[PDB]
Design a protein around this ligand. Structure first.
Ligand SMILES: N#Cc1cc(Cl)cc(Oc2c(Cl)ccc(CNC(=O)c3[nH]c(CO)nc3Cl)c2F)c1
Lengths: 560, 406
């Protein structure tokens, strides 16, 4: 049948301290035992396997299967035990190539290697462990036994050793053809050059022949696939690329399974269709689940899905990369902590788009989110193109400088420019750096009991006001945020607040504009309405005047 | 030379650490470097049957334009600690921190002459990646002692002693310490003389085939950062509160700090702006605290069986404060670094602090770094110039700890 490469074999070992597999073969039907003899004979002739006697003590089970409306039999070997015992190998491919990172080429050819694994030898010292046995009719006589001389299907080392082999075989060609691009992916090779079609169709052949001289067979000009190439969920045309067509189902009733698959089809679409959202659709899945159970769509979810259909209405495409030009990345806020971005080299011809719509922690603001989004896009660009883009961001240079210079975490956006595409990222309040003369100084505190969970939150002020609200099923943290919230409602537009909660202070000093906490979100509304808030901290239980008095009020029937 | 066998710990296996994405600039720089190293037999390509990996980066050597290869052997260093710390440990001299000037010489080239035990070589595997996963990306392992591996100078220790025997005999008041790829040379000499002795040392080294801080370090010009307390003509309720808070947290470190009188001044429910004249008792209580803060901490000592931690705080205006300790609030050292961008500055502080840490204890500390993991991990290599890498983790450590130190 087909060649096996003369390439040097990769030494292979079992995991230290483990002997090979010795799994018992289970008896099979005559039908199967016949199918298997027919197959293994045919394989032996071709060099893939060899007969070996009962000297070899190892065994892996074997099986034959034939589909319902069919007549070809297939052999299945169950390498689970040998795989447990085979060494770990180096991970095949760190990632998979993005279309947007491909450089356009005048002519491009796809070459699948035929029967890749069977075209490569296996380390002789290791073959013995690949032993299997076709058994006799009702297991009377000892079975016929074999071992592989090539890479077996489903064995742990085949993918890696194959790639390794193809790499070594390609090295020379590459050195003597530096202007030719050869992508390696699984059995495939994608070959692109800027040469004129005549010289391209020549060079392809030298490759096919170079490959054949190492036992690797490939399809000839007649059998070679044509543009556009369908590949890994993409369409690859001669000067553009897109995702393969997206069919958004129309349903009376939506199941978890229907929504799960929809989110995915959209998430996949988001890499070239700008503006795709999935927040409201994802919210639905945040529950006990049950694939076949119907979830009725909410209004927000229907508005979101409808908007997505509109975007997907007419097809959209992305250009290929051009390493002479720079990369420009633009980001826009879609609201709800959803961010959308586009990357182009010439405006507005996108290489790709994407979305960031994440929640790092519990309390956050847009300035922080935009930084994260920038950070994410920057890693993405280093992976795809090998350089970082120039950014264009909806934030005043002024707003940015104020934030970073005063914030406590180190932070750093690389070269960027402001672009006035509303909504703009701003900070919605700032806290005073100095106490406010002629403003009521509230001293606030909260206390919760750990057994009962019954809390109290309140204040005492220098104008002699006081309040104490009682809370049920609460915690120390929540009472201390209630305490600040009371002080904000009851005070007027200017106010100083003293607290003994580093927890509250820390949250509130980071200038959040959104939270998972409802109480924080209320405290936020208030801080915006105010004109001046100063917020200081004193240590608790030190008899600091003001603090001590609200401490007595909130401790009443809660703690000693 | 006959190769020294290196036994990895029982139980532990070699590093399996993913490579952080590199830019084209650095990938091309690495492909050039690794090509030469292959020709010179220092590294050899490896097959897929080597499952191990350690990350690699490219930097520019301190104030230079050529690229240098920097392997991150942090995992491999943890997993081979018995070899380099116990079995062949290089002892740290306490003299070094006392000397007037200390000079740091790179001596990493020394190691490329000594072959590495063939059974260990697989644990030094690393990868040059490719852009957009075009190619599977090039895989090497080391044949000679690699730079960055704490085992290397441990092995080379006996060769380094021969190299330096004449110089030491001729200069018995000069202290020389090897830490990883660098030599630390300390003298009390006049700086002109010091530099003459360094050039002399360069020449000894040259005969064995070996070509955030200033030129030299000045350890004896390192002293503490007292936690300082403001001095004012007029004090407010707020100022006192801030002072009591500051004093309060200080008292966990310094025993004897007292605020009883100070608190008495705030009795009531007073407006923050209202001024409050100090009583004789309190002013004396403050003065007493102020005395305690200028002086060193009693009871706090370096324990060689414990890791060193370093915390750093961003003070604004290009200012960064930092503390080194082993048990929280038992500070072994405190300091300040000054004057670009947040990341560039922060990496400068880390290297500076690490260096002092090598000088004082022969150990780098684990940093608690106030920054987003990803931001740090993208950028740090842009301004890094050291041959080593300390351990770091990331924290969101506000708020007044910032104000408590500057
Ligand atoms: N199947 C498949 C497949 C998958 C990948 Cl990741 C790449 C691939 O080949 C390409 C290579 Cl090697 C380089 C660039 C592109 C982008 N497309 C072209 O340049 C291109 N040119 C032409 C005719 O000039 N058709 C196509 Cl498609 C390529 F498409 C083919």
């Amino acid at each position: 049948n087909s060649p096996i490469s003369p390439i040097e074999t990769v030494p292979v070992k079992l995991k230290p301290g483990m002997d090979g597999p010795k799994v018992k073969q289970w008896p099979l039907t005559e039908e199967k035992i016949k199918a298997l003899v027919e197959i293994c004979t045919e394989m032996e002739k071709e060099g893939k396997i060899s007969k070996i006697g009962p000297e070899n003590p190892y065994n892996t089970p074997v099986f034959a299967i034939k589909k319902k409306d069919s007549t070809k039999w297939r052999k299945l070997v169950d390498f689970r035990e040998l795989n447990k015992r085979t060494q770990d190998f180096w991970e095949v491919q760190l990632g998979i190539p993005h279309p947007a990172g491909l450089k356009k080429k005048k002519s491009v050819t796809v070459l699948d290697v035929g029967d890749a694994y069977f075209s490569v030898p296996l380390d002789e010292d290791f073959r013995k462990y690949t032993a299997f046995t076709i058994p006799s009719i009702n297991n009377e006589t000892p079975g016929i036994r074999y071992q592989y001389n090539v890479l077996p299907q489903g064995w742990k080392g085949s993918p890696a050793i194959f790639q390794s082999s193809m790499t070594k075989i390609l090295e020379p060609f590459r050195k003597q053809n530096p202007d030719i691009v050869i992508y390696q992916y699984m059995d495939d090779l994608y070959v692109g050059s800027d040469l004129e079609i005549g010289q391209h169709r020549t060079k392809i052949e030298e490759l096919r022949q170079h490959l054949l001289r190492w036992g690797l067979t490939t399809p000839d000009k007649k059998h070679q696939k044509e543009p556009p190439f369908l590949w890994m969920g993409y369409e690859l045309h001669p000067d553009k690329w897109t995702v393969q067509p997206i069919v958004l189902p129309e349903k009376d009733s939506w199941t978890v399974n229907d929504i799960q698959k929809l989110v995915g089809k959209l998430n996949w679409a988001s890499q070239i269709y700008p503006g795709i959202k999935v927040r409201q659709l994802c919210k639905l899945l945040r529950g006990t689940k049950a694939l076949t159970e119907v979830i009725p769509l909410t209004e927000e979810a229907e508005l979101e899905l409808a908007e997505n259909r509109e975007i997907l209405k007419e097809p959209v495409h992305g250009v290929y990369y051009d390493p002479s030009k720079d990369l420009i990345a633009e980001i826009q806020k879609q609201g709800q902590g959803q961010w959308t971005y586009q990357i182009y080299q010439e405006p507005f011809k996108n290489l790709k788009t994407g979305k960031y719509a994440r929640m790092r922690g519990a309390h956050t603001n847009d300035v922080k989110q935009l930084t994260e989004a920038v950070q994410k896009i920057t890693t993405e660009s280093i992976v795809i193109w090998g350089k970082t883009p120039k950014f264009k961001l909806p934030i005043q240079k002024e707003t940015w400088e104020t934030w970073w210079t005063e914030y406590w975490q180190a932070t750093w956006i690389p070269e960027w420019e402001f672009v006035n595409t509303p909504p703009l990222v701003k900070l919605w309040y700032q806290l005073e750096k100095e106490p406010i003369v002629g403003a009521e100084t509230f001293y606030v505190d909260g206390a919760a009991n750990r057994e009962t969970k019954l809390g109290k939150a309140g204040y005492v002020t220098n104008r002699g006001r006081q309040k104490v609200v009682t809370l049920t099923d609460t915690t120390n943290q929540k009472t201390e945020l209630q305490a600040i919230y009371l002080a904000l409602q009851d005070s007027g537009l200017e106010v100083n607040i003293v607290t003994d909660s580093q927890y509250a202070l820390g949250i509130i000093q980071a200038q959040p504009d959104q939270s998972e906490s409802e109480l924080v979100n209320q405290i936020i509304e208030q801080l915006i309405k105010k004109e001046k808030v100063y917020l200081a901290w004193v240590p608790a239980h030190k008899g600091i005047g003001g603090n001590e008095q609200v401490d007595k009020l909130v401790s009443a029937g809660i703690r000693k | 030379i006959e190769t020294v066998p290196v036994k990895l710990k029982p139980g532990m296996d070699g590093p399996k650490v993913k490579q952080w994405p590199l830019t084209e600039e650095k990938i091309k720089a690495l492909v050039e470097i690794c090509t030469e190293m292959e020709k010179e037999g220092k590294i050899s390509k490896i097959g897929p049957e080597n499952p191990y990996n350690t990350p690699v980066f490219a930097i520019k050597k301190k104030d230079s334009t050529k690229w240098r290869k920097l392997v991150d052997f942090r995992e491999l260093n943890k997993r081979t600690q018995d070899f380099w710390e116990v079995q062949l440990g290089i002892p740290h001299p306490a003299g070094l921190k006392k000397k007037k000037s200390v000079t740091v010489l790179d001596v990493g080239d020394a190691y490329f002459s000594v072959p590495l035990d063939e059974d260990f070589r697989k644990y030094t595997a690393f990868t040059i990646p490719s852009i957009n996963n075009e190619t599977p990306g090039i895989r090497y392992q080391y044949n000679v002692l690699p730079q960055g591996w704490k085992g290397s100078p441990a092995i080379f220790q006996s060769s380094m002693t021969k190299i330096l025997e004449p110089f030491r005999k001729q200069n018995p008041d000069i202290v020389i310490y090897q830490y990883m790829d660098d030599l630390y040379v300390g003298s009390d000499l006049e700086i002109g003389q010091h530099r003459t002795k360094i050039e002399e040392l360069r020449q000894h080294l040259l005969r064995w085939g070996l070509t955030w801080m200033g030129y030299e370090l000045h350890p004896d010009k390192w002293t503490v950062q007292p936690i300082v307390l403001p001095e004012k003509d007029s004090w407010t309720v707020n100022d006192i509160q801030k002072l009591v808070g500051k004093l309060n947290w200080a008292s966990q470190i310094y025993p004897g700090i007292k605020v009883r009188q100070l608190c008495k001044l705030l009795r009531g429910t007073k407006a923050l702006t209202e001024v409050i004249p100090l009583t004789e008792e309190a002013e004396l209580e403050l003065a007493e605290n102020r005395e305690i803060l200028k002086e060193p901490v009693h009871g706090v000592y370096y324990d060689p069986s414990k890791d060193l931690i370093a915390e750093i705080q961003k003070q604004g205006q290009g200012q960064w404060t930092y503390q080194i300790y082993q048990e929280p609030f038992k500070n072994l050292k405190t300091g300040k670094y000054a004057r670009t961008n947040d990341v560039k500055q922060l990496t400068e502080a880390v290297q500076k602090i690490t260096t002092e840490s090598i000088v004082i204890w022969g150990k780098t500390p684990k940093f608690k770094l106030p920054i987003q993991k990803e931001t740090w991990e993208t950028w740090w290599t842009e301004y890094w110039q050291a041959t080593w890498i300390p351990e770091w983790e990331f924290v969101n450590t506000p708020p007044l700890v910032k104000l408590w130190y500057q």
